Design a protein around this ligand. Structure first.
Ligand code: NAG
Length: 639
C-alpha cells in the first residue's frame, strides 16, 4: 500500500532494548496533521521516545510526530526503548498499524503495511522431533491398561447398537453423531446389536472397560462419564476402510480409569471473541481426549462477552472496541469495530451441547481487577470521580480496577453473579481474584473512609472485603467460588474457595497444605499461547518460555508425591489454558492448541508408569489422519 512502517532492533543490553521506528510516505500526496497508531504488547518507556509524543493504553499506541507535515517519498524516524531482554519472535513486533491525517479539513484513515521486525538475536537452535513409527492403536490419552489380540472385528452399518442402561444414553448418542460427522458412517439402535453398552456398578467414576471380540464390542461402565470416555477411545480405535462401507477395530481388552478428577481447558474469549460454532467445535474436541471441564474466560479488560439482562450496557458497550467505540482497539482489528458476545440463549445451547459430551462449563467473571470493559460500560455505577490514584496494571492500564468502597460495585457484582448462577448449572463460579496493581485505591476518598470503618491499615485489605462479599453471595446462590492463586494470600477468601495455581507445583502444594482445594495450571508447561518452536516465524508468546511438544509431554504433575499422600485429596486436577492476545481466528487457534492438548490430556488422564515419549509420538502420528479428516489445523510434528 501507500504507507509502510519498519521496526528495527538498534541495541540489546540486559533488561533493556532500543528500537528504530521508520515510517514511509510512499504516496504521491503530502500528509498533513498526521499521526501513527499501532498495536504493541510491551510497555514503551515514555521518556525514551526520541521524536514525538507517545500515548499507550494497553497494546494500543498512538504516536504524535513532532512534524506537522510529512512530504511525499519522505520518512519519519523515531526511537524508543523498553525494559526487556532480547526479542526472539517476529510476533513481538507491531501486529497492525494505521494512520490518521487531514485532507481539505476532513479526517482520513489508512492501514499501514508493517514490515516484519528486524530481529537482532533470533534463536539459532531448533526443536527437533525424532522420526517415528506409526502405532497400530493411536490412542490419546493412553489407556492405563490395554491388551491387544491377534484378531480384528470388521462390522458394517447394520451391526446395531444395544444399550442396557440409561447411563449410556448420552455416550451412545455422541458416538453415532461423531461416526456420522467424521466418517459418514451411520449406526442404529438394535436390541440385538453387535455393539453393546452394559452397566457395571463396581467401576469408579469415569472408569470403563472396553472389550473388542471377533463379532462384538462390549462397553462396560458404572457412570455416564465412563461410557463417554469409552466412546472417545472407540473413535480412535476404529479404522474405516474405503471401497467397503465398513469399520475395523483390533480385538483387545481395555480397562481404564482417570488419574485426576478435574481435567480442564480454559479458553480466553475476552481478548478475542470466538463464535458459538467455534466454541462448540473445541468443546467436542476436548471430549475426544477425555477432558471433562471447559473453563470459559468470558470477561477481561479487552472485552465483556456474557449477556446480562439487568445490565444491557455490558454487552452493548463492553462487547465492542474500536476508534469510534468507547473502548479502545487492542491487539488486532485497529481499523474496524471489533467484538461479539454470547447471548444467554446461545450460552444455554452451549451448556446443553457440552453436557452431551460429559463436559462441565465453569464461567469466570473477573473482579476487582481486569475489569476495564465493565468500568467503561457502567461509568456512573463503577467510577469514583474524586479518585486521583496513579497506578499501572501488568497489562499497561491505569483505569481498570473496581472500587470496593462504591455501592455501585456491589450492585454490579450481585446482579452479574445472580444471572451467572441461574444461567450456569455447574456448582462453581470463578471470580478472578487477580492481584491488584500496586498502590491501587491509595488516593481514593471513598476507600480511605472504608478503611477507617473496617480497621484496615493497608489498602490491599479492601480486596478481601470485596472478594468475601462475592464468596458469600455465591454461597447464597448455591455456588462454590473459584479463584487464581493470589486469592489464597491474606484472608481474602475462605478455605472453600478453589485455588488455580500457575506459579509452581511447590506453591500449589503449599496452598493445598493450608486446606484449600487446588487446580494445577502451571504457566511454564500448560500455557498453549506459548510458542511451539525456537524459529522466529513461530506464532505465540514466550514470556514463560517456548513450549515445544517434548517439554509439554515431559510435564509430569506430582511425580515426587506418593500415591497414598493425603495431600492428593486437595488436588482437584490439571488444567491447560489458551490466552488469546494474538489468537483471533480458528486456524491460529487450532495451530496453538494441537497437538499439545493431547499431551496435556495424557498428563491429566494416564498414570506416569504408562507414559513414554517415544510411544506417545507413535500414537500421535497414527492419530494425525483422524485430525485431518476433521480439518483441524494442528502444527505438524513432522514437516
Ligand atoms: C490469571 C492471569 O493473570 N493470567 C495471565 C493472563 O492475563 C495473560 O493473558 C497470560 C499471557 O500469557 O498470562 C497469564 O499468566
Amino acid at each position: 500500500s501507500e504507507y509502510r512502517v519498519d521496526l528495527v532492533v538498534l541495541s540489546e543490553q540486559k533488561q533493556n532494548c532500543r528500537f528504530g521506528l521508520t515510517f514511509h510516505n510512499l504516496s504521491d500526496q503530502d500528509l498533513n496533521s498526521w499521526g501513527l497508531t499501532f498495536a504493541f504488547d510491551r510497555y514503551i518507556l515514555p521518556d525514551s521516545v526520541s521524536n514525538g509524543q507517545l500515548t499507550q493504553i494497553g497494546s494500543f499506541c498512538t504516536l504524535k510526530p513532532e512534524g506537522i507535515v510529512l512530504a511525499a517519498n519522505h520518512h519519519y524516524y523515531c526511537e524508543f526503548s523498553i525494559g526487556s531482554n532480547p526479542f526472539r519472535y517476529y510476533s513481538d513486533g507491531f501486529n497492525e498499524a494505521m494512520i490518521d491525517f487531514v485532507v481539505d479539513g476532513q479526517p482520513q484513515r489508512a492501514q499501514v503495511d508493517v514490515t516484519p521486525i528486524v530481529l537482532a538475536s533470533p534463536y539459532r537452535e531448533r526443536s527437533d522431533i525424532p522420526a517415528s513409527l506409526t502405532h497400530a492403536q493411536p490412542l490419546l490419552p493412553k489407556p492405563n491398561h490395554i491388551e491387544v489380540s491377534d484378531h480384528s472385528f470388521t462390522f458394517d452399518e447394520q451391526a446395531g447398537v444395544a444399550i442396557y442402561t440409561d447411563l449410556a444414553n448420552s455416550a451412545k448418542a455422541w458416538l453415532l453423531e461423531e461416526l456420522q460427522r467424521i466418517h459418514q458412517f451411520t449406526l442404529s439402535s438394535s436390541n440385538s446389536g453387535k455393539i453393546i453398552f452394559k452397566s457395571n456398578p463396581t467401576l469408579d467414576e469415569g472408569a470403563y472397560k472396553l472389550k473388542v471380540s471377533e463379532e462384538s464390542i462390549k462397553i462396560e461402565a458404572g457412570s455416564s462419564s465412563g461410557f463417554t470416555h469409552a466412546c472417545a477411545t472407540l473413535l480412535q480405535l476404529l479404522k474405516r476402510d474405503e471401497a467397503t462401507k465398513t469399520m475395523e477395530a483390533v480385538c483387545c481388552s481395555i480397562i481404564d480409569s482417570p488419574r485426576f478428577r478435574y481435567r480442564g481447558m480454559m479458553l480466553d474469549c475476552a481478548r478475542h471473541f470466538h463464535s458459538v460454532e467455534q466454541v462448540k467445535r473445541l468443546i467436542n474436541l476436548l471430549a475426544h481426549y477425555k477432558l471433562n471441564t471447559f473453563h470459559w474466560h468470558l470477561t477481561d479488560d479487552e472485552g465483556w462477552r456474557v449477556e446480562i439482562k439487568s445490565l444491557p450496557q455490558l454487552t452493548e458497550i463492553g462487547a465492542w472496541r474500536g476508534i469510534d467505540e468507547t473502548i479502545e482497539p487492542q491487539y488486532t482489528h485497529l481499523s474496524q469495530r471489533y467484538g461479539g458476545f454470547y447471548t444467554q440463549e446461545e450460552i444455554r445451547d452451549v451448556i446443553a451441547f457440552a453436557e452431551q459430551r460429559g463436559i462441565t462449563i465453569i464461567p469466570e467473571i473477573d473482579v476487582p481487577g481486569h475489569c476495564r470493559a465493565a468500568i467503561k460500560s457502567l461509568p456512573h455505577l463503577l467510577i469514583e470521580a474524586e479518585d486521583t490514584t496513579e497506578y499501572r496494571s501488568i497489562q499497561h492500564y491505569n483505569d481498570n480496577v473496581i472500587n470496593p468502597a462504591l455501592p455501585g460495585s456491589y450492585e454490579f457484582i450481585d446482579k452479574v453473579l445472580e444471572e451467572i448462577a441461574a444461567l450456569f448449572p455447574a456448582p462453581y463460579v470463578h471470580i478472578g481474584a487477580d492481584e491488584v496493581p500496586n498502590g491501587v485505591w491509595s488516593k481514593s476518598p471513598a476507600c480511605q473512609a472504608l478503611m477507617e470503618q473496617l480497621g484496615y491499615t493497608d489498602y490491599k485489605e479492601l480486596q478481601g472485603h470485596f472478594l468475601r462479599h462475592a464468596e458469600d453471595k455465591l454461597r447464597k446462590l448455591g455456588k462454590r467460588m473459584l479463584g487464581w492463586e493470589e486469592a489464597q494470600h491474606g484472608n481474602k477468601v475462605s478455605k472453600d474457595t478453589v485455588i488455580y495455581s500457575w506459579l509452581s507445583e511447590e506453591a500449589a502444594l503449599n496452598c493445598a497444605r493450608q486446606g484449600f482445594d487446588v487446580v494445577l495450571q502451571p504457566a511454564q508447561t500448560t500455557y498453549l499461547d506459548m510458542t511451539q518452536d525456537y524459529a522466529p516465524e513461530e506464532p505465540g508468546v514466550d514470556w514463560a518460555n517456548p513450549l515445544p511438544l517434548e517439554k509439554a509431554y515431559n510435564y509430569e504433575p506430582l511425580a515426587e508425591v506418593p500415591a497414598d499422600d493425603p495431600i492428593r485429596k486437595r488436588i482437584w486436577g490439571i488444567q491447560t489454558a489458551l490466552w488469546c492476545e494474538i489468537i483471533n481466528n480458528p486456524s491460529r487457534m487450532d495451530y496453538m492448541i494441537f497437538p499439545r492438548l493431547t499431551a496435556m490430556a495424557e498428563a491429566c488422564w494416564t498414570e506416569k508408569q504408562h507414559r513414554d515419549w517415544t510411544d506417545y509420538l507413535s500414537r500421535l502420528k497414527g492419530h494425525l489422519p483422524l485430525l485431518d479428516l476433521q480439518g483441524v489445523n494442528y502444527r505438524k510434528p513432522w514437516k
